[PDB]
Amino acid sequence: SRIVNVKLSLKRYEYEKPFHITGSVSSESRNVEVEIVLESGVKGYGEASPSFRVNGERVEALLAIENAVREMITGIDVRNYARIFEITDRLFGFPSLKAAVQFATLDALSQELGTQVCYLLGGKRDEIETDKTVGIDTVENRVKEAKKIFEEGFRVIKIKVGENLKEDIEAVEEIAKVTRGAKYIVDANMGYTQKEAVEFARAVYQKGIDIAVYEQPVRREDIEGLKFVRFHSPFPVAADESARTKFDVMRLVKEEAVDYVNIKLMKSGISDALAIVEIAESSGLKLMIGCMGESSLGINQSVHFALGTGAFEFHDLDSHLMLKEEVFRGKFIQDGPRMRVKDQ
Amino acid sequence: SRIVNVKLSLKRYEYEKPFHITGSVSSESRNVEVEIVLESGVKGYGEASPSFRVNGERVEALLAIENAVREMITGIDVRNYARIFEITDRLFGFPSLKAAVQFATLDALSQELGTQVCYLLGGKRDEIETDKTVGIDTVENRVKEAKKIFEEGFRVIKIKVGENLKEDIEAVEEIAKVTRGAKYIVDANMGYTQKEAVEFARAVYQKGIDIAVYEQPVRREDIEGLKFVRFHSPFPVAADESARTKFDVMRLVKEEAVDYVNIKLMKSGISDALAIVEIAESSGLKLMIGCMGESSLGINQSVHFALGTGAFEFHDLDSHLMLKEEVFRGKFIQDGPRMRVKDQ
Amino acid sequence: SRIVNVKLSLKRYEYEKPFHITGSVSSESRNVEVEIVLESGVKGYGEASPSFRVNGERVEALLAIENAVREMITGIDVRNYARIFEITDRLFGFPSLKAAVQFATLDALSQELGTQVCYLLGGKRDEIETDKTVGIDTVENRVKEAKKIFEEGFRVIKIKVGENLKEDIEAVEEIAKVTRGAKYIVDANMGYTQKEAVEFARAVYQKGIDIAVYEQPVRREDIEGLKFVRFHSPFPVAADESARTKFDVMRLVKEEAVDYVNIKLMKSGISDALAIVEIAESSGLKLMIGCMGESSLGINQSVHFALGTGAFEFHDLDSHLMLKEEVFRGKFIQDGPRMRVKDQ
Amino acid sequence: SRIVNVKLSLKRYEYEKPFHITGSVSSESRNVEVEIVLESGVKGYGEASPSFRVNGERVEALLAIENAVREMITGIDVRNYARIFEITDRLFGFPSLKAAVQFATLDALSQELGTQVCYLLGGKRDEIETDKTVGIDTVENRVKEAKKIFEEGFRVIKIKVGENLKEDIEAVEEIAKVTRGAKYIVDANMGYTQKEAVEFARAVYQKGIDIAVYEQPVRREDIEGLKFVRFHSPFPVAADESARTKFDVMRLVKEEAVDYVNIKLMKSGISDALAIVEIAESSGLKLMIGCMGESSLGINQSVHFALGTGAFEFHDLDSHLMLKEEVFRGKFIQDGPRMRVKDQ
Amino acid sequence: SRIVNVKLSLKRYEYEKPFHITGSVSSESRNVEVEIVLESGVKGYGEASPSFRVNGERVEALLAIENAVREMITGIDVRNYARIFEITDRLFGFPSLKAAVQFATLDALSQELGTQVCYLLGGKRDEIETDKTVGIDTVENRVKEAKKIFEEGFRVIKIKVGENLKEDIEAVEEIAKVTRGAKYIVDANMGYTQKEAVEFARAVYQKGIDIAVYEQPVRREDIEGLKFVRFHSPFPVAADESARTKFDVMRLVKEEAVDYVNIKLMKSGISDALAIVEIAESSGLKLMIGCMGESSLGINQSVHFALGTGAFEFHDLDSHLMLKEEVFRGKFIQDGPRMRVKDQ
Ligand SMILES: [Mn+2]
Ligand SMILES: [Mn+2]
Ligand SMILES: [Mn+2]
Ligand SMILES: [Mn+2]
Ligand SMILES: [Mn+2]
């Protein structure tokens, strides 16, 4: 049935503690929740968690375009969801809102069909497992946090690096010693030069440490640099900030620049994310899925995407786990590091 | 709900006249119909129209593997269709059967969800239009046939060439004269050398004739030859036989070999065809969709695929129109050269 | 001296008639004017003319981030303009505002230094000349409009094409006949396939018509397509939508994709535009400068940029001339199609 | 205001001790000071420190063209500095004089505007820090000099190598032991083969020594050799002699040959140096700035360039620190290894 | 025997009329004559005809370095000429002087050996033939000048173009009409864009005119542009300004940029010129030899080089023929457009 209203609302979520990554420290997520209302009375929901650093977005700006978004899709039947996806692909300057609107569309459609979004998308998996992230801090505090995560039962530990190469090498080496059995993802958030990035990898390799995925060591535009790291260090290299659109991923594949792509709905929307999954499966690329600052309602989007496509070797879906005092609003089951589909 | 049976049956369909293409002439279509039965009682249908020349398939061979196909997917819920797609991707030696089983799966699922396959696939378009094909014959007979097609309301005329460069040039020029306003697709079915293919295009261009799509002038393995034709003649060049899998298309894109890909479900199945649509839309590829010897139930698969994805500039879905007075078994409206979505 | 305030204000300007280009028609320009106030009392001005189609921007979104922009640069001395440029490079999601803030900074600094922005930028030229644009309409109306422009003294005529290849060829041929001596720029605003773009160029060449610059015939992401047109047609090919950032231009240069780049301050800001001038002058790129929907105060930014750097073979700075009777608010002399530096 | 005179004068500066690099030993700098006099009475100053080895120049030859230089720019207003830059770009056979004249122009212009050259150039930084260089000598003497430099408070030590691979490896390893905490730049001044250069780097890497920048290990024309070193050894590789012009740098970027460029005003002039900064910032290249045999008045040129653009990770501006008995004639503050902008 | 003195002297030669080429017009040749005196009493002679536009040289600068040149080679036996060549290769900033000194060396050695320079170089040919050049002027005057040249017995006519595409096309077409049977070399001296250069060639080709060699249509640094012209127009393309050194030529060969190189001793010296001959003969390069403003003593250098190596399809050795009534000072026979070896 046809969309009759679209509502955007500011929702704020406080962190338990400041989240520090290369070039950014944040203590709060300010997101935009999207509600799509159909003539049937069905309501679908999405969440835009904007990124100034990655997408150039500001939450004030997303909220400002409510009327435009409404006018762009009101009157369209959610069964013609490809029309909605094409229209919302015009929101390339507001990719988090693109994502939220596209997901809300599928959330509404799946209800009208008596199913769930993961099933519309293929129903490949019934369960996925997330890592949890260690932010930047003193070496001692990074080690402490990594151990905590390991004690919580997380089997993959994501470690932020990028601001201090020497301390980064030390932190990862100390973490490895006290979390024997864990797999490690290292995310440099564009902090290193090509040569610094190679040296980080070599240093930890020399201690017999294996890094499962080494994310975006160099700047967004430095595709040749990503390739250099890939070809001169022993760990799989992922594009994150360099992989926002489906066109970005075609370029990465053509240049043989990466082993992995980290898909985020907040970069790509559902439309480009689906294209990227297909490109990757046609090209020997492996995939992980990540997040920005989504609450449980926002993480829901990626949970259904990951369950449905089953495309991901790794899942970095932990933003909702970093919140101070939250009421759970996902349409999935959180069970420790695992997420599962609802019977209903 | 879960698959409880899978049935394969031989179905034969007679042509109105022998269909002559480069290196092949046939008077009959021998297809394998697939029925999937669910525990709910819902039945989904697909059709495999095999190709010995393109896929290396034989109809007897498809029939012989009924028990294997049944064992592979019985017990799986169609809501987990990605699992069925991944399993049936193992049928790469029987791609027409891969397509039929994958479509039958979606036919059944759409019924359980109270919708149509085109809608599962995005519901992008409500209407498409097909060309109709002029087979190889004497120049006089080719012209007669083209005039017949034009008087049946077709606005796009597909002209088979490839066995006689001089007569092919003459036939196309004479056809152009008696079908003013039509658009032309020329399909050489691998018959020309790269230089012959260039000279065919040049000869027709010099007469002021525009060819909308120039399909597969050279052999399947001759990607560099396809590229040569692309870069040295004025009309858009399509891969057909060179584009069977999603991997083939990634290679064509990397090599900049073609302007178009002709997707056929009988080459790719649903899984690879969806991948190819995504790759093309991420790479400035244009698309057409074609067929083998599908009857109306078989063409239904492509009609829903094309309506739902809306991915195609041109449609060459005319096999059922070349067959001799069948009872109509599609789930779409055939409106002269137009196909329209049902109500349902 | 130091910035003490930054003010953003909505300013609307009516067109003389609807401006139709490939995929877009507008009757009004809604811009954001930027005022920077220094502790000295000096005020500098810029204008953001946003583009949804090219930059993904919306005017409401620009307005919404006034406080953020103010916080980002308040307290900084305009003599340290490189610091302001680096900070405002973070506004990559709001490139038109990036441009306006960067220019306002130089407008204020030049006043404190007792000079003009063109002189800060090198003072290369005292005079430039702009084309004027023929929008899409019926062939008869396009010809009427071109004749009007020719009788207004313009020596370079920019002709929009892209929606109808046959009518575009006819319009350009008819325009050429009634504007003998004019030079022509043809802007396809991404409307053609690579092969259609080649055939447009060939058709006009065969009539003995020379096109000075053939702008962006293909889509933004289709760099290989741009190169194809460049290598297979006789006129200089320009990137417009494909050249937004300095990084885009390095890629175009590496791929040998174009003969020209059309710099627009609304895509690049001052910072990337200066980089692009330097890259082009180091690579055998030629340059033109264009606009969006700037009023006279907005066009001033480009006039000073073009006068100072002297980098452009062609100038397409006509947006203010398409606007309905404004009070002139430039800091340059408008002398028919010519712009000249002030005394001051 | 307009240039009314240009004067060239020979100035000789004796070194405290002979400076030995690969293929060259010198005990004195013979420079050409440039004075530009304006009609306002303002006087701007530059210095050409010619290089026979790098630029093919001889000081006698620079002095010989005084009248030509005068005639080329007399009567031009320094506010049109781009015109002066374009004219003096014709002095590509006398690049040190090109640099001196271009800087003298900005020195005069900045006085007329009531500011400083660093501010005309962006005012990005208020302070920079230089390394100091260890020349070639016996291993013992090289170690002694490196220790002295470290004791002087220099945090980056530049070590000349290139004439004796075995002794070079020994010297760098011994230096590292006695200067723990220092960063190292190694400059081979074209002395090594590709394979020798890789082996030098590997040998020192094996002792746990990090080289911040490894400059020009191979000959000027051996771009492929520079790339080979870059791709097969662990340290960032810089072009110096291979990077004289902006066109050279475009080639280096296209070939992915280097991690760094060492800009010297004496190679590039201000015009090409500014282009190189822009190219580098558009291409993932990092930068250092170096010198020839400039006195304090000559080093002033690079100090303002480096302060203003803030483009450099490393500064090798130490030629004026190697002089016997000199009267300071810079327009900056020297404060140990640091240089700072004047309040005035 | 050993060099005991080296003398440089200014020699001026007046043209018959101003010689206009793209971006340069001159009425006089100011050359530096080199005399090398041996202990045996034998004297060898060379001539440097410098080029500011191509080499960046000034005659005053060449004169200024007499003492340096003398110190560099005095005391060396001319039988060890490779030592003198390697030393004078250091004069890369004064390439015309490099050439003059290297030739004077061979002039002296050949005398001591009782032979001629052409014989030292292989004695391949006894006779060569030169073109003569039509400078830029009005179309009427260019045609007049070409007719004059044709009536002086020249069979190859070199036509300068580059400043006015339309008039250049007209001039060449009119010249072709009045010089039936002549071969044509067209030298654009870097005046055209790649596309303008293509269109010049196409326009003349369409008139049935063949251009034997089309020299340097684009700028020195624009190697990719040279290649573009080569691949997109029907006449052989030559590098002139882009081929100064042996390293330049290796790059041109690797890039497949040209059909021809124009060797000039004033760009390359004897050493690089011999290298270029060997490279060309190993790569399917064809060669022509040109000049700057050499008098008869200067042209002698090129005549012996061309006679001895026999490497050139075309000779453009006409500078002495454009000079106003000189006493003949060559060591060859000038026989109309032909040059022949002496007896001795
Ligand atoms: Mn990441
Ligand atoms: Mn076909
Ligand atoms: Mn445009
Ligand atoms: Mn160096
Ligand atoms: Mn020439």
Side-chain angles (χ1 to χ4, degrees), chain C residues 183 205 208-212 234-236 313, chain E residues 22 136-137 139 142 159-174 186-188 190-205 207 214 217-218 229 233 235:
Chain C
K183 290 180 190 170
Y205 180 92
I209 302 169
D210 192 23
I211 301 306
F235 309 128
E313 192 76 22
Chain E
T22 300
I136 298 172
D137 205 318
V139 173
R142 295 158 91 172
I159 303 163
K160 295 290 185 172
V161 306
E163 298 187 339
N164 184 327
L165 178 59
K166 290 176 198 310
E167 286 188 8
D168 294 333
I169 289 164
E170 186 63 27
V172 168
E173 291 170 353
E174 289 188 30
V186 170
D187 184 350
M190 311 186 285
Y192 296 150
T193 63
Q194 318 170 11
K195 298 264 167 178
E196 284 169 349
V198 169
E199 291 310 313
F200 168 86
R202 287 182 176 165
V204 305
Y205 180 92
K207 292 294 156 171
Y214 185 18
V218 301
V229 180
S233 53
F235 309 128

Side-chain angles (χ1 to χ4, degrees), chain A residues 237-248:
Chain A
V237 174
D240 177 1
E241 292 93 323
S242 294
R244 296 182 304 172
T245 70
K246 59 197 186 182
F247 300 101
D248 291 341

